[PDB]
Amino acid sequence: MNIMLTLLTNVTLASLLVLIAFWLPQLNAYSEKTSPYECGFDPMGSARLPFSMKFFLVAITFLLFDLEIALLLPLPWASQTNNLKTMLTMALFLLILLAASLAYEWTQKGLEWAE
Amino acid sequence: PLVYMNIIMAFAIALAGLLMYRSHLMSSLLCLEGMMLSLFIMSTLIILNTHFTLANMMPIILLVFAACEAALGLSLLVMVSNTYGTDYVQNLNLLQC
Amino acid sequence: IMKDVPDWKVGESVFHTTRWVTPMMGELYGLRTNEEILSATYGFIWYT
Amino acid sequence: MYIAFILSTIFVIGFVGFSSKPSPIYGGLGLIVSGGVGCGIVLNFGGSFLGLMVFLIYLGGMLVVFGYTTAMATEMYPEVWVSNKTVFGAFVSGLMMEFCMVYYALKEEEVEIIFKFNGLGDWVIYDTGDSGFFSEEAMGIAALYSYGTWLVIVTGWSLLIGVVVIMEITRGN
Amino acid sequence: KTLLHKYSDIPEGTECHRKAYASTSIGGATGLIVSAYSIALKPPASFLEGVARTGRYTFTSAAIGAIFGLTSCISAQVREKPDDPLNYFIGGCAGGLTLGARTRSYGIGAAACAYMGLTAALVKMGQLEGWQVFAEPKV
Amino acid sequence: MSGRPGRVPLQFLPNEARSLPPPKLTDPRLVYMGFLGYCSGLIDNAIRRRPVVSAGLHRQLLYVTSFVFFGYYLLKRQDYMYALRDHDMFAYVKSHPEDFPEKDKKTYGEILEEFHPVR
Amino acid sequence: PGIVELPTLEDLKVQEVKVSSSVLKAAAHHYGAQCDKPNKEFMLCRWEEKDPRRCLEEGKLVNQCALDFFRQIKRHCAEPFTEYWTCIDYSGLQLFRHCRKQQAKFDECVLDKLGWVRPDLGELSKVTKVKTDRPLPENPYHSRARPEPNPEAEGDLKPAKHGSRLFFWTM
Amino acid sequence: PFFDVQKRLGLDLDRWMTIQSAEQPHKIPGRCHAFEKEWIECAHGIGGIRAEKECKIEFDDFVECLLRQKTMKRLSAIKRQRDKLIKEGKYTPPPHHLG
Amino acid sequence: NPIIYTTLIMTVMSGTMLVMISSHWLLIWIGFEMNLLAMIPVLMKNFNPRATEAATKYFLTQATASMMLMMAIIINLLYSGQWTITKMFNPVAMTMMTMALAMKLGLSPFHFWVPEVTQGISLQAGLLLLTWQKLAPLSVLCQISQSINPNLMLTMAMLSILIGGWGGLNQTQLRKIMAYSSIAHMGWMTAVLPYNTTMTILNLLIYITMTLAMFMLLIHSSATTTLSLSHTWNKMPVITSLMMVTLLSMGGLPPLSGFMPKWMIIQEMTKNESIIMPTLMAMTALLNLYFYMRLAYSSSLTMFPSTNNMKMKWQFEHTKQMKLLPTMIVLSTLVLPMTPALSSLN
Amino acid sequence: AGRIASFLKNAWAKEPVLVASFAIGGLAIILPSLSPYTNYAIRINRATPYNYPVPLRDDGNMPDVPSHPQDPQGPSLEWLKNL
């Protein structure tokens, strides 16, 4: 439970810092201080309107690629098996498959910011 | 054991959550995504318990396709959000006939 | 411990076969103390 | 024993976090924490690789879903677990749902709902075997490139088809 | 499925009170399912009309079960002919009349009486003989 | 069937199906399936609005040959399944005499079948 | 559903070899070379019988034989063992690499004082055979008589009697 | 498989995982290698339906080894009655069972 | 780009073939995504708001069924420890799977998705969805037919036939009624599935071939409404003739090949002492026959008013070859006299 | 000849990293065929003992396996000792 003890201590020590930084250093709020910041002026009124991406295409490819790397994390242990021959081909095959998918997306536009 | 009960009722409310749309598809899509987390934890619990070395395979490989299902899922939601603007399932009825 | 129970064979064969089985550790540490439980059952994983 | 059952209990009401339809990333809050404690459930059973994997790619996977929510799935007034009355009803109904059975399990240990399982904790279900010098989980995963082979091919080929599929559906002519 | 056994155990005629009560349980249960499907496929609006729709359906279905159950046993007791298929017919036809009363339209109740009357004799037809609807794969 | 011993999956007419007499080329079932080839020939020119009886005979000849070819092996497999069904069947009754007794067939002089007057 | 049998508390007690792990692994290379015959006998019992309750006698033999092994080294050069095992203790991984000088001092006692040589690499990791005289367990898994397989189809294929026999299809 | 392409060419595609007592990475045994072995080679070439009543004993024991529920229930009866009477008195723990 | 559309079509076929050749419970699921992954692109190939409509509706139900399908496997793993494709060893898990597979097939009230998706997507993709994904769940149902719950599957089959054929006479779009008609045919093959698996394959093949022959005819006619199909008599009256012949074929009147399954299905069910159930499904199959003739009534058997511009269509000719059309038509109408071929499947 | 040389010139001029990454990726695939130490790498993993090689009962006529981990007969690894 040693990891639990340091985890508990860490989140505790963080909580004291926010605790005495909210009660000790005075309190005075009169609305316009409490208002959002828009570089000096009053916002158009939102911060909740759809802030549509312009790079949505690459986001999903990250999920496919961040997923597939989890398939090759076992590589250090995969090297120390009695069958490195098929290990070499299969592990290589994954890297070309990611390479092909990146190459496929690259050629058909893709990574460049969708406009 | 009791740990198994906790995580199969994790499926049940996830099952209830998925096929219960209130306002928007994104919340249900996330529930579909999180539904496999119980599925991951479920399958993972037997496999380390039973010491079956090979079948440690499938928790990772279930993760390949469950999140891939989500990958095409929220990318489908992109096509909705351009024609539909919002992501509401209540509006998602233009094929009323 | 088994005197009050109506029907109880003391140390009956757990399975229908007579071949020995690796002992389900619940039989091992079932009635031991709490610290001995955590020292071995959760010992390795919780150890650093 | 506490932690083994207690962590799974957090996994439960954590799942209530997103199954009750809060604002989508408040649901993201719901399953990211159960994903965090879900690492703990497999961790206590060994399972360090798998426990870290979910704490690796879920955060990677959940990294973009927030963006889609705040970019193309957010409202003028984002939801919360207390604002809307139905979702609060959905939240609470996810609280007595497991509360009765854990009390039933803690008091009787013979709960029959759907499946039959006893309630002597879960420290019993562990083993007495010795791993020698090899972790069972980390080597079964490493058997991907020695004995997976075909099981590798179907995963890799689909990932290629993935990047084709996620491209053409969103291309829009 | 326990309700089906809770109705079949009681011999025809005797214990007509329990037989009638059992028939209400099947009628009440079936009304709950159709009502649950009704407000799910077609959402009325708020809870007040939703519970009214379930109330109308549950009351109606239980009504058919109640009168059909009590008519079957009293007919068997009075006529002293438990095996007679018509012991269910007069209960079955009465089911249509009650449905016609529940729907406030005797026009559809008249045709319902024959339809539920014929089926009621048919379920007694199979109960008497070895008829089975969900046969196990014998071949 | 799907579980009989000594079966090779995805294997068409096996090495013992040839022990049965082959279907004749004048098999009425075979020529009918050839007639389906003839029928599938004439209709083809109907969609493409061609002379339904005097258009390209190569298509019609190829339409008939394909049907008569694949049919012959199917007609060979036809009997082999039935022969295999018949073969094992007779082994079971031989191997299980107690399930198939032989009644002492007695003439109608002893049978008391009652008479139904109709009038 | 039957009987479990366990040896009584008397015959499962031996003169247990009570010395720390580091000392055991410090002399493990020399221990595995000569003190091997009881060891090889012990788990031919462990793998053939597949039942620890049937191998207590071999467990006694290996425990006492190791005791004679530890008696020999203690009697001849006890002091050179001292520095070798304590520097193994200081290593968290019990690494042999930071022990070569101390290992050298240990090695030349038993080679010259007693005649014990140091096995080289891949020496103890062998499939070597052992001359156990005990009977071979006939049914290690205690399996019962198995059900007889269904009779095998035999004979020759005859044409289907009266054709397909389906409704009104003559053949 | 609907089409047992595995058996046709004789090359395995997914049969290596299937059952528990298949070959393992440098022979790491499963929990129920013995029980699962006894059940599998009991009902081999005998038929799926002609396997339940005959090769039963090798199966419930195997599914016992997998779940160990009746034995955990056995431990439940031991622990439950233990806390029943030690709280009432009688039993005092022997000095090895509590340290 | 056509070269890639060959690949995703191939993967859908490859994934389906993966399901029907796998002995591992895991790989069977893997084929379902391989079908599911590459299906959505070809479902919204035209990229219409209806295409995005149907694609989203398809994905939600299909993903739910496949996701429900694992812990049906996982509980089997919990209570059996076996991955092999055999009978299931835990009842509640396999009941859970039957709902999952029925969701993929669209038999129970689960069936709501198939008529909705079919309308939004084009005819060509409608054929592929309605004729190719009805094999992978069929293969799994065929394999697990040993321990199948009789009441569970028969109830699912009856509803699929009932609602499948009951709402059929309420849709003016052909793509809708075929989806409605398919659910009725879905029930027919699934009803026999618990009893004998062989007749399920024959009814599958017979239904499949008719499914091409009609959908393939519809593409040639290029019709979306019954009135649109009605105008076909003024260009290619022969095409509209095979139209009705296939309708009566799909109805099931002999000698037409649509009487193949209806004749064969009730046979072993009567052999299995199930007689009331065969009677009800046959009688309610007349509901299928009703809107079958109504489409035949509007298309072939009677004329219908045409348009002025329709004349110029006579001058030009169709350019699509529409491969394998004549063989499907004959294989969908004149097949009954060759009945004993069910043994070849057996 | 001329086309490939100009093409290599163009690739090395515009995006050197990609024509690079194709190079390291290129030969890392075909070196395994030309590798003379892959067989040693095979022998490396076989030699490493994880499970202890349980002894075998000797009913006679196995001269290869020794009776003791000191006799010369049996599989050996002096290639590793040299290496």
Side-chain angles (χ1 to χ4, degrees), chain G residues 117-171:
Chain G
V117 313
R118 165 61 161 243
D120 54 340
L121 224 37
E123 187 75 7
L124 313 79
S125 48
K126 271 196 196 307
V127 153
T128 204
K129 70 205 157 201
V130 46
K131 277 295 300 310
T132 278
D133 316 349
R134 94 173 180 253
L136 208 178
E138 214 282 332
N139 199 339
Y141 283 67
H142 277 121
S143 152
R144 75 206 215 207
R146 320 210 80 71
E148 212 51 46
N150 38 279
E152 174 54 61
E154 87 298 320
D156 43 358
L157 263 75
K158 290 250 201 51
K161 169 161 300 314
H162 311 329
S164 147
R165 294 205 302 282
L166 178 135
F167 290 90
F168 50 95
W169 261 261
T170 75
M171 61 66 58

Coordinates of all heavy atoms in Angstrom, one line a residue, chain G residues 117-171:
Chain G
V117 N 34.3 -28.4 -7.0 CA 34.6 -27.5 -8.1 C 33.4 -26.6 -8.4 O 32.3 -26.9 -7.9 CB 35.0 -28.3 -9.4 CG1 36.0 -29.4 -9.1 CG2 33.7 -29.0 -10.0
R118 N 33.7 -25.5 -9.1 CA 32.6 -24.6 -9.4 C 32.0 -24.9 -10.8 O 32.8 -24.9 -11.8 CB 33.2 -23.1 -9.5 CG 32.3 -22.1 -10.2 CD 30.9 -22.0 -9.5 NE 30.2 -20.8 -9.9 CZ 29.9 -19.8 -9.0 NH1 30.2 -19.9 -7.7 NH2 29.3 -18.7 -9.5
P119 N 30.7 -25.3 -10.9 CA 30.1 -25.5 -12.2 C 30.2 -24.3 -13.1 O 30.0 -23.2 -12.6 CB 28.7 -25.9 -11.9 CG 28.8 -26.4 -10.4 CD 29.8 -25.6 -9.8
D120 N 30.4 -24.5 -14.4 CA 30.4 -23.4 -15.3 C 29.0 -23.1 -15.7 O 28.0 -23.5 -15.1 CB 31.3 -23.8 -16.5 CG 30.8 -25.1 -17.2 OD1 30.2 -25.9 -16.5 OD2 31.2 -25.3 -18.3
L121 N 28.8 -22.2 -16.8 CA 27.5 -21.8 -17.2 C 26.8 -23.0 -17.9 O 27.4 -23.9 -18.4 CB 27.6 -20.6 -18.2 CG 26.6 -19.5 -18.0 CD1 26.4 -19.3 -16.5 CD2 27.1 -18.2 -18.7
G122 N 25.5 -22.9 -17.8 CA 24.6 -23.9 -18.4 C 24.9 -25.3 -17.9 O 24.6 -26.3 -18.6
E123 N 25.5 -25.5 -16.7 CA 25.9 -26.8 -16.2 C 24.7 -27.4 -15.4 O 24.4 -28.5 -15.7 CB 27.1 -26.6 -15.4 CG 27.7 -27.9 -14.9 CD 28.5 -28.7 -16.1 OE1 28.6 -28.1 -17.2 OE2 28.9 -29.8 -15.8
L124 N 24.2 -26.7 -14.4 CA 23.1 -27.2 -13.6 C 21.8 -27.2 -14.4 O 20.9 -28.0 -14.1 CB 23.0 -26.4 -12.3 CG 24.2 -26.1 -11.5 CD1 25.0 -24.9 -12.0 CD2 23.7 -25.8 -10.0
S125 N 21.6 -26.3 -15.4 CA 20.4 -26.2 -16.2 C 20.5 -27.3 -17.2 O 20.7 -27.1 -18.4 CB 20.3 -24.8 -16.8 OG 21.5 -24.4 -17.4
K126 N 20.2 -28.5 -16.8 CA 20.3 -29.7 -17.6 C 19.1 -30.6 -17.4 O 18.5 -30.5 -16.3 CB 21.6 -30.5 -17.4 CG 22.7 -30.0 -18.3 CD 23.9 -31.0 -18.4 CE 25.1 -30.4 -19.0 NZ 24.9 -29.7 -20.3
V127 N 18.9 -31.5 -18.3 CA 17.8 -32.4 -18.3 C 18.2 -33.8 -17.6 O 17.4 -34.7 -17.6 CB 17.2 -32.6 -19.7 CG1 16.5 -33.9 -20.0 CG2 16.2 -31.4 -20.0
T128 N 19.4 -33.8 -17.0 CA 20.0 -35.0 -16.5 C 19.1 -35.9 -15.8 O 18.1 -35.6 -15.2 CB 21.2 -34.6 -15.6 OG1 22.2 -35.6 -15.5 CG2 20.7 -34.3 -14.2
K129 N 19.4 -37.2 -16.0 CA 18.5 -38.3 -15.5 C 19.0 -38.8 -14.1 O 20.1 -38.5 -13.6 CB 18.5 -39.5 -16.4 CG 19.9 -40.2 -16.4 CD 20.1 -41.0 -17.8 CE 21.6 -41.2 -18.0 NZ 21.8 -41.5 -19.5
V130 N 18.1 -39.4 -13.4 CA 18.3 -39.9 -12.0 C 17.8 -41.3 -11.9 O 16.8 -41.7 -12.6 CB 17.7 -39.0 -11.0 CG1 16.3 -38.6 -11.4 CG2 17.7 -39.5 -9.6
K131 N 18.4 -42.1 -11.0 CA 18.3 -43.6 -11.0 C 17.2 -44.1 -10.0 O 17.5 -45.0 -9.3 CB 19.6 -44.2 -10.7 CG 20.5 -44.4 -12.0 CD 19.8 -45.4 -13.0 CE 19.7 -46.7 -12.3 NZ 20.9 -47.2 -11.7
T132 N 16.1 -43.4 -9.8 CA 15.1 -43.8 -8.8 C 14.6 -45.2 -9.1 O 14.3 -45.5 -10.2 CB 14.0 -42.8 -8.8 OG1 14.3 -41.6 -8.0 CG2 12.7 -43.4 -8.2
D133 N 14.6 -46.0 -8.0 CA 14.1 -47.4 -8.1 C 12.6 -47.6 -7.8 O 12.1 -48.7 -8.0 CB 14.9 -48.3 -7.1 CG 16.4 -48.0 -7.1 OD1 16.8 -47.2 -8.0 OD2 17.1 -48.4 -6.2
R134 N 11.9 -46.5 -7.4 CA 10.5 -46.7 -6.9 C 9.6 -47.0 -8.1 O 10.0 -46.7 -9.3 CB 10.1 -45.4 -6.3 CG 9.4 -44.4 -7.2 CD 8.8 -43.3 -6.5 NE 8.1 -42.4 -7.5 CZ 8.6 -41.2 -7.8 NH1 9.7 -40.7 -7.4 NH2 7.9 -40.5 -8.7
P135 N 8.5 -47.6 -7.9 CA 7.6 -47.9 -9.0 C 7.0 -46.7 -9.6 O 6.8 -45.7 -9.0 CB 6.5 -48.8 -8.3 CG 6.6 -48.4 -6.9 CD 8.0 -48.2 -6.6
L136 N 6.7 -46.8 -10.9 CA 6.1 -45.7 -11.7 C 4.6 -45.6 -11.3 O 3.9 -46.6 -11.4 CB 6.3 -45.9 -13.2 CG 6.4 -44.8 -14.2 CD1 6.6 -45.3 -15.6 CD2 5.2 -43.9 -14.1
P137 N 4.1 -44.4 -11.0 CA 2.7 -44.3 -10.7 C 1.9 -44.6 -12.0 O 2.1 -44.0 -13.0 CB 2.6 -42.8 -10.3 CG 3.9 -42.2 -10.5 CD 4.9 -43.2 -10.6
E138 N 1.0 -45.6 -11.8 CA 0.2 -46.0 -12.9 C -0.8 -45.0 -13.4 O -1.0 -44.7 -14.6 CB -0.5 -47.3 -12.6 CG -0.7 -48.3 -13.8 CD -1.8 -47.9 -14.7 OE1 -2.8 -47.3 -14.2 OE2 -1.7 -48.2 -15.9
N139 N -1.5 -44.3 -12.4 CA -2.6 -43.4 -12.7 C -2.3 -42.1 -11.9 O -2.9 -41.9 -10.9 CB -4.0 -43.9 -12.4 CG -5.1 -43.1 -13.1 OD1 -4.9 -42.0 -13.5 ND2 -6.2 -43.8 -13.2
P140 N -1.3 -41.3 -12.4 CA -1.0 -40.0 -11.6 C -2.2 -39.1 -11.4 O -2.3 -38.5 -10.4 CB 0.1 -39.4 -12.4 CG 0.6 -40.5 -13.3 CD -0.5 -41.4 -13.6
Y141 N -3.1 -39.0 -12.4 CA -4.2 -38.1 -12.4 C -5.4 -38.8 -11.8 O -6.5 -38.1 -11.6 CB -4.6 -37.7 -13.8 CG -3.7 -36.6 -14.3 CD1 -2.3 -36.8 -14.6 CD2 -4.1 -35.3 -14.5 CE1 -1.5 -35.8 -15.1 CE2 -3.3 -34.3 -15.0 CZ -2.0 -34.6 -15.3 OH -1.2 -33.6 -15.8
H142 N -5.3 -40.1 -11.4 CA -6.5 -40.8 -10.7 C -7.7 -40.8 -11.6 O -8.8 -40.6 -11.1 CB -6.8 -40.2 -9.3 CG -5.9 -40.8 -8.3 ND1 -5.1 -40.0 -7.5 CD2 -5.7 -42.1 -7.8 CE1 -4.4 -40.7 -6.6 NE2 -4.8 -42.0 -6.8
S143 N -7.5 -40.9 -12.9 CA -8.6 -40.9 -13.9 C -9.3 -42.2 -13.8 O -8.7 -43.3 -13.5 CB -8.1 -40.6 -15.3 OG -9.0 -41.2 -16.2
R144 N -10.6 -42.2 -14.1 CA -11.5 -43.4 -14.1 C -11.5 -44.0 -15.5 O -10.9 -43.6 -16.4 CB -12.9 -43.1 -13.6 CG -13.7 -42.3 -14.7 CD -14.8 -41.5 -14.1 NE -16.0 -41.5 -14.9 CZ -16.9 -40.5 -14.9 NH1 -16.7 -39.4 -14.2 NH2 -17.9 -40.6 -15.7
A145 N -12.2 -45.1 -15.6 CA -12.5 -45.7 -16.9 C -13.3 -44.8 -17.7 O -14.3 -44.3 -17.3 CB -13.1 -47.1 -16.7
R146 N -12.9 -44.6 -19.0 CA -13.6 -43.6 -19.8 C -14.7 -44.3 -20.6 O -14.7 -45.5 -20.9 CB -12.6 -43.0 -20.8 CG -11.2 -42.8 -20.2 CD -10.5 -41.6 -20.8 NE -11.1 -40.3 -20.3 CZ -10.9 -39.9 -19.1 NH1 -10.1 -40.5 -18.2 NH2 -11.4 -38.7 -18.7
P147 N -15.8 -43.5 -20.9 CA -16.9 -44.0 -21.7 C -16.4 -44.6 -23.0 O -15.6 -44.0 -23.7 CB -17.8 -42.8 -21.8 CG -17.4 -41.9 -20.7 CD -16.0 -42.1 -20.6
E148 N -17.1 -45.7 -23.4 CA -16.7 -46.3 -24.7 C -17.2 -45.4 -25.8 O -18.3 -44.8 -25.8 CB -17.4 -47.7 -24.8 CG -16.6 -48.7 -25.6 CD -15.2 -48.8 -25.2 OE1 -15.0 -48.9 -24.0 OE2 -14.3 -48.8 -26.1
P149 N -16.4 -45.2 -26.9 CA -16.8 -44.4 -28.0 C -17.9 -45.0 -28.8 O -18.1 -46.2 -28.7 CB -15.5 -44.3 -28.9 CG -14.4 -44.8 -28.0 CD -15.0 -45.7 -27.0
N150 N -18.7 -44.2 -29.4 CA -19.8 -44.7 -30.2 C -19.3 -45.5 -31.4 O -18.2 -45.3 -31.9 CB -20.6 -43.5 -30.8 CG -19.7 -42.3 -31.2 OD1 -19.3 -41.5 -30.4 ND2 -19.4 -42.2 -32.5
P151 N -20.0 -46.6 -31.8 CA -19.5 -47.5 -32.8 C -19.2 -46.8 -34.1 O -19.9 -45.8 -34.5 CB -20.7 -48.5 -33.0 CG -21.9 -47.8 -32.4 CD -21.4 -46.9 -31.3
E152 N -18.1 -47.2 -34.7 CA -17.6 -46.6 -36.0 C -18.4 -47.1 -37.2 O -18.7 -48.3 -37.3 CB -16.1 -46.8 -36.2 CG -15.6 -46.4 -37.5 CD -15.9 -44.9 -37.7 OE1 -15.4 -44.0 -36.9 OE2 -16.5 -44.6 -38.7
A153 N -18.8 -46.2 -38.0 CA -19.5 -46.6 -39.3 C -18.6 -47.4 -40.1 O -17.4 -47.1 -40.4 CB -19.9 -45.3 -40.0
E154 N -19.2 -48.5 -40.6 CA -18.4 -49.5 -41.5 C -19.3 -50.0 -42.5 O -20.5 -50.0 -42.4 CB -17.8 -50.6 -40.6 CG -18.7 -51.8 -40.4 CD -20.0 -51.4 -39.6 OE1 -19.9 -50.6 -38.7 OE2 -21.1 -51.9 -40.0
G155 N -18.7 -50.6 -43.6 CA -19.4 -51.2 -44.7 C -19.2 -50.5 -46.0 O -18.2 -49.9 -46.2
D156 N -20.2 -50.5 -46.9 CA -20.1 -49.9 -48.2 C -21.4 -49.1 -48.4 O -22.5 -49.4 -47.9 CB -19.9 -50.9 -49.3 CG -20.7 -52.2 -49.1 OD1 -21.5 -52.3 -48.1 OD2 -20.6 -53.1 -50.0
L157 N -21.3 -48.1 -49.3 CA -22.4 -47.3 -49.6 C -23.3 -47.9 -50.8 O -22.7 -48.3 -51.8 CB -22.0 -45.9 -50.1 CG -22.0 -44.8 -49.0 CD1 -20.8 -45.0 -48.0 CD2 -21.9 -43.4 -49.6
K158 N -24.5 -48.1 -50.5 CA -25.5 -48.6 -51.5 C -26.4 -47.4 -52.0 O -26.6 -46.5 -51.3 CB -26.4 -49.7 -50.9 CG -25.6 -51.0 -50.7 CD -26.0 -52.1 -51.6 CE -25.7 -53.5 -51.1 NZ -26.2 -53.7 -49.7
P159 N -26.9 -47.5 -53.2 CA -27.8 -46.5 -53.7 C -29.0 -46.3 -52.8 O -29.5 -47.3 -52.2 CB -28.2 -47.0 -55.1 CG -27.2 -47.9 -55.5 CD -26.7 -48.6 -54.2
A160 N -29.5 -45.0 -52.6 CA -30.6 -44.7 -51.8 C -31.8 -45.5 -52.2 O -32.2 -45.5 -53.4 CB -30.9 -43.2 -51.8
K161 N -32.4 -46.2 -51.3 CA -33.6 -47.1 -51.6 C -34.8 -46.2 -52.0 O -35.2 -45.4 -51.3 CB -33.9 -47.9 -50.4 CG -35.2 -48.7 -50.5 CD -35.3 -49.8 -49.5 CE -34.2 -50.8 -49.7 NZ -34.0 -51.2 -51.2
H162 N -35.3 -46.5 -53.2 CA -36.4 -45.9 -53.8 C -36.2 -44.3 -53.9 O -37.1 -43.5 -53.7 CB -37.7 -46.2 -53.0 CG -37.9 -47.6 -52.8 ND1 -37.4 -48.6 -53.6 CD2 -38.5 -48.3 -51.8 CE1 -37.7 -49.8 -53.2 NE2 -38.4 -49.6 -52.0
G163 N -35.0 -44.0 -54.2 CA -34.7 -42.6 -54.5 C -34.6 -41.7 -53.3 O -34.4 -42.1 -52.1
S164 N -35.0 -40.4 -53.5 CA -34.9 -39.4 -52.4 C -35.8 -39.7 -51.3 O -35.6 -39.3 -50.1 CB -35.1 -38.0 -52.9 OG -35.7 -37.2 -52.0
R165 N -37.0 -40.4 -51.6 CA -38.0 -40.7 -50.6 C -38.6 -39.5 -49.9 O -39.1 -39.6 -48.8 CB -37.5 -41.7 -49.5 CG -37.1 -43.0 -50.0 CD -37.2 -44.1 -48.9 NE -36.3 -43.8 -47.8 CZ -35.0 -43.9 -47.8 NH1 -34.4 -44.4 -48.8 NH2 -34.3 -43.6 -46.7
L166 N -38.6 -38.3 -50.6 CA -39.2 -37.1 -50.1 C -40.5 -36.8 -50.8 O -40.5 -36.5 -52.0 CB -38.2 -35.9 -50.3 CG -38.7 -34.5 -49.9 CD1 -37.6 -33.8 -49.1 CD2 -39.1 -33.7 -51.0
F167 N -41.6 -37.0 -50.1 CA -42.9 -36.8 -50.6 C -43.2 -37.6 -51.9 O -43.2 -38.9 -51.8 CB -43.2 -35.3 -50.9 CG -43.3 -34.4 -49.7 CD1 -42.2 -33.8 -49.2 CD2 -44.5 -34.2 -49.1 CE1 -42.3 -33.0 -48.0 CE2 -44.6 -33.4 -48.0 CZ -43.5 -32.8 -47.5
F168 N -43.3 -37.0 -53.0 CA -43.6 -37.7 -54.3 C -42.5 -37.6 -55.3 O -42.8 -37.6 -56.5 CB -44.9 -37.1 -54.8 CG -44.9 -35.6 -54.9 CD1 -44.6 -34.9 -56.1 CD2 -45.3 -34.8 -53.8 CE1 -44.6 -33.6 -56.1 CE2 -45.3 -33.4 -53.9 CZ -45.0 -32.8 -55.1
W169 N -41.3 -37.5 -54.9 CA -40.1 -37.5 -55.8 C -39.6 -39.0 -55.8 O -39.1 -39.5 -54.8 CB -39.0 -36.6 -55.3 CG -39.0 -35.3 -56.0 CD1 -38.3 -34.9 -57.1 CD2 -39.9 -34.2 -55.8 NE1 -38.6 -33.7 -57.5 CE2 -39.6 -33.2 -56.8 CE3 -41.0 -33.9 -54.9 CZ2 -40.3 -32.0 -56.8 CZ3 -41.6 -32.7 -54.9 CH2 -41.3 -31.8 -55.9
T170 N -39.8 -39.6 -57.0 CA -39.5 -41.0 -57.1 C -38.1 -41.3 -56.9 O -37.7 -42.3 -56.3 CB -40.0 -41.6 -58.5 OG1 -39.2 -41.1 -59.5 CG2 -41.4 -41.0 -58.7
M171 N -37.2 -40.5 -57.5 CA -35.8 -40.7 -57.4 C -35.0 -39.4 -57.5 O -35.5 -38.3 -57.3 CB -35.3 -41.7 -58.5 CG -35.6 -41.3 -60.0 SD -34.7 -39.9 -60.6 CE -33.0 -40.4 -60.3

